[PDB]
């Protein structure tokens, strides 16, 4: 079993949240965390477009990268509940970017396949460090 889980086989994924926080702090790179489920068809549709989007794949190398099929113990990573797919950003000061949200008022950190442009723009937002 690989850490990529189909999200980007050529990227460098971190295994655990604790390690990801350490790597963010020490590298001064922000952390992008993708929450997904194998049985979730929405997760799969987003994974496909994420994996194949050249701009996202390129910009992702500026992040510490974590994808999870089980929730962390950090309540800051679910400001508006636990659903997948859900993409959160963490600043290297170890501040969760709850202010970096997607298009939908009801699920603020959900992204649909058509939302790659907004995802890219949010990644740029996360790179403007606190």
């Amino acid at each position: 079993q690989t850490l990529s889980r189909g999200w980007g086989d050529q990227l460098i994924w971190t295994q655990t949240y604790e390690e990801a926080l350490y790597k963010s702090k020490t590298s001064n790179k922000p952390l992008m965390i993708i929450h997904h489920l194998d049985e979730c068809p929405h997760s799969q549709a987003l994974k496909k477009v994420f994996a194949e989007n050249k701009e996202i794949q390129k910009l992702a190398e500026q992040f510490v990268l974590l994808n999870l099929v089980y929730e962390t113990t950090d309540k800051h990573l679910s400001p508006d509940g636990q659903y997948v797919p859900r993409i959160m950003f963490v600043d290297p000061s170890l501040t969760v970017r709850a202010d970096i949200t997607g298009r939908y008022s009801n699920r603020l950190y959900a992204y649909e396949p058509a939302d790659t442009a907004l995802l890219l723009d949010n990644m740029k937002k996360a790179l403007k460090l606190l």
């Binding site: 709850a98 202010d99 959900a110």
Partner: peptide
């Protein structure tokens, strides 16, 4: 204001929220 149902529900950091405003 769009909503999505393109989700499945699941059965030492600080946090930063947006700055505030008076509700309409």
């Amino acid at each position: 204001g769009p909503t999505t149902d393109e989700v499945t529900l699941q059965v030492s950091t600080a946090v930063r929220y947006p700055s505030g405003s008076v509700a309409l």
